[PDB]
Design a protein around this nucleic acid. Sequence first.
RNA 1: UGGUAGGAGU
Lengths: 49, 224, 49, 222, 220, 79, 313
Amino acid sequence: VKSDDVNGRTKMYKNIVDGNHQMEPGMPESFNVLLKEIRSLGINIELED
Amino acid sequence: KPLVGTGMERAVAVDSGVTAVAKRGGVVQYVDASRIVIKVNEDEMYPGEAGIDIYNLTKYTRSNQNTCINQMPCVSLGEPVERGDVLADGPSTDLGELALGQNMRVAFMPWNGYNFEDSILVSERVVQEDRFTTIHIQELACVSRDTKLGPEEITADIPNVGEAALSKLDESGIVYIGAEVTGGDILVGKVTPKDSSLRVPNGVSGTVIDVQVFTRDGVEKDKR
Amino acid sequence: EIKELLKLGDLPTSGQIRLYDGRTGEQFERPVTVGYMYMLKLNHLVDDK
Amino acid sequence: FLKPRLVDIEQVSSTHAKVTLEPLERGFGHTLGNALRRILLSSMPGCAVTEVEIDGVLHEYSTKEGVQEDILEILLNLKGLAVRVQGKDEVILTLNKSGIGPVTAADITHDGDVEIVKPQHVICHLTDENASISMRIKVQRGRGYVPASTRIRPIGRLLVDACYSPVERIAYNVEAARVEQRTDLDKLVIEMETNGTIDPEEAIRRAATILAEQLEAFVDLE
Amino acid sequence: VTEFLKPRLVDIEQVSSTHAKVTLEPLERGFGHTLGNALRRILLSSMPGCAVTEVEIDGVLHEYSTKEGVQEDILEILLNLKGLAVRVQGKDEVILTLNKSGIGPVTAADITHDGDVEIVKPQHVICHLTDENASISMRIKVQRGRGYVPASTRRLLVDACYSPVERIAYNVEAARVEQRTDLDKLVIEMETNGTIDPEEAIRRAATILAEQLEAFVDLE
Amino acid sequence: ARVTVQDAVEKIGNRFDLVLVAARRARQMQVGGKDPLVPEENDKTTVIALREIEEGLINNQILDVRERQEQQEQEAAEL
Amino acid sequence: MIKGKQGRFRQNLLGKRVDYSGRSVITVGPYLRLHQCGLPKKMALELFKPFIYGKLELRGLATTIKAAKKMVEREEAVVWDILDEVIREHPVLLNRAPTLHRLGIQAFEPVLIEGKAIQLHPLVCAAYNADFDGDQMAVHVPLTLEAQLEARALMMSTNNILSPANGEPIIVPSQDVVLGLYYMTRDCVNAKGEGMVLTGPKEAERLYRSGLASLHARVKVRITEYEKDANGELVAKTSLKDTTVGRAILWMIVPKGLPYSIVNQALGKKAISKMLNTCYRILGLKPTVIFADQIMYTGFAYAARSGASVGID
RNA sequence: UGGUAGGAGU
Ligand SMILES: [Mg+2]
């Protein structure tokens, strides 16, 4: 929430000013960047469910 | 000057370029906070086109570490000087001796834990007489870049800002010399076609000593 | 030589003076060293940190 | 309890004075001495300089032509100028001088209510007789130390640090005093070091008045 | 410029009947320390009060000895009498006598009433009598004084404690006001023997200190 | 201005689910319209919930039964 | 750009930079309690900005976010009163540049101070390995309610008494407090007030303060000592003891459970550590924290009063 | 701006 989750960042900032102190975890953007970097070498990365 | 020192401080002070040392001795014809003029003695005075050498002191100028460099005349009017004596004191020198800091009364005792491990407790008298105040010179540069949609101009009128900001600026969009600026205050116009004006960074509050303008050969010159 | 120089002035040879507390006003025991020391101010300012 | 009375205001110099208190019970001497010293070094009315304007200069980091000393050094010299105003809490002092020679504080144009304790104080030196200097000195009444940063308009005005404090060194001793036959009577002498602006006896009276006023906080009137 | 900040009894908290804690509104920088130290010195050094100074017992004639049937040592007897707190009206010198026999603690109320003198805590224990047939006949003499007078400076001699105050501790910590960032808050502790309440002790000390400055404050 | 947690830890020994239950209770106070049980004195919801947990009137089972009562009230208002 | 220290895995995935963080030089504050820490007013204003905005919107001084932002930038009078409410009970995480211990990062309850330096508790600095010589420490603000509860329950300095490496206590009087305690708890062959018999510790303090008796004079003081012989109950034991004035004065701050034998000795650093460990074993945590604060204050005060100094003689 | 060194602090 303080580093990479841009949606988490804006939601946390909006929550704080409203008196709420919740938190949406989300996914860091650094991890997605790493996923794309590894996919760029012909290695298949997938967050399989 | 240090009350107790090794004794070579004079050598390291004169051997650096900070202090102005008289190359030819004589008498001090004219002294001033900006320059010193020495009347050379006849014996040391060359026969052909004999004259008097002029020492121009460098006043407050920014150093590499953003500290002030200034020369203080340590000689009076009419005081004789010889070859090799220091005429002006550079930064952190006193009468030709390397004066790095200040000497003050010191007591070695614990005091209510305020000097716990390496902390130091300083009397308010030290602050009151301004004996540890240091000058700091900063350099802020603005460039009139040639971006698309028309060149960027340095002009006074800044859209969508208060007149108070323009009050400090002159009619040419440059800050007056000697203005007590503070963090965020506009220093130049720097209006871009479409706003982005160079301003004092936050936490900085000091008078503007001088402004230097470099202009490309061929373009017009603003009134400032 | 330092002791002789101190005796040249009107100072104790041991180099320690009895100091009085500033606020309480009661003199400290164990005479405390007092003297003049050359102190420097380093470039590690605090408003820059 | 015997009441202390002030008996001697003996002065050994213009800036040095010793004030003695003859009658004092045992234990009261040190208490009164310490309280008086703290309340004298802490809070006393002063008349230090606050503002200065020089016609030629704009900012205090510049150098005036024909003046031996830098403008910052001139301001630092002015900071130590000791002056007392007996009628007003605000005054404007004008200094005008021309020709070769040191510019002492005696050259300041003076009014009836403004006097200089030590005219020998030097401000700056003029090296060229053609050059001339002019100042407008602004003097205010205050107490404590008020830095120039915490003031809360024109370019010409130069701000100096203000330290309104006439006293700079207070020392006291408690000695045995012989009154009639009873012993334990103590004599308290207080040695003062002012800049000449504030009288010693008046300083003691003001300090004791402040101490008595502050004592009324946790006690009913007495 | 002569105006100064004035606190008004921001908190006078009573831990018990004989113990209190006093707090003050923001004081100017450095006034907390001087006020606290002045009150401390006045209370510990110069406060009128009455206490036992010497005691004569017919049973024991030496400082170190033994009394039959008394589990308390002779030294402990002096401490118990010294801890006794008594207030006397008018007369500056009065002698108190106490005789008792039988098993049971010799409480403070056991002493003869002796008219004007009052004992703050009658439950105070002086000594214990182990034997029913054992008896104690002791005579104490008290007088009004000022401050603590040790026995060394001074027939059994017991160091007197004239001042009603047992413990004084002043603490100063920073306080915040909108106009002035650096100010002082004075916290004064109090431990009196019970004859005079802590608030009255502080009032009397302040009155003494302000009375000592009457001559200085002239035409003010 | 609570300084210790040990007394509240004695109620819930793990001291790890203490954080969870106290966070749930404080979320109930500060997000919903729920008013604290223990009297409040210009304190943050953190310390208010911790002081309730200390007094023994708040537990995981107590919160569960309270939530069940609120669920029953909500379903009752439906019909 | 994947492998190595400069790669994503080490630099960005495990080393994310965090908002709501600040850095400043540290300095010692002896006024602080164990759980507190200094914090500059400007640093606190910058870190807690969204909370200030929310409080301004709730109170109603600022209608919109832009108005609140302008008001905060103006640092008006009302902003400081709002700030005092926000940071009233909000812990802040403090850590040193090298973080070796689990205790390298700890949570404190902040107090607003003037200046640009973070005031740190003297006893805490032992675990941080701080030296107060240009040392720097970064602060972090836990935002979410779970994070605040978590910091209060686990990371607060009052909780970290014993190091995880070994059972020995991690807070201990170190440099000046131990010197003051050693100076106070010492005996001189001949001193002012020797041979006196005193009623109790309060009398010893009164005698030392008035100057009638020295801090090292051997005397006989009646001491009320409590021993928990019964399970959960304390029985008082009063007796005359041959101790100095300084030991009697120090006995006042000692809790009820501890015996008197600990104070009677010379009280070196090992003795102080043993006394703190004994308090932790017997009376739990809260009395140990109060005792540590009292020990630090008393040691600092009496070390200052001692006037110990080093000289060439 | 961003990548490199360069020196320094703990
Ligand atoms: Mg360090």
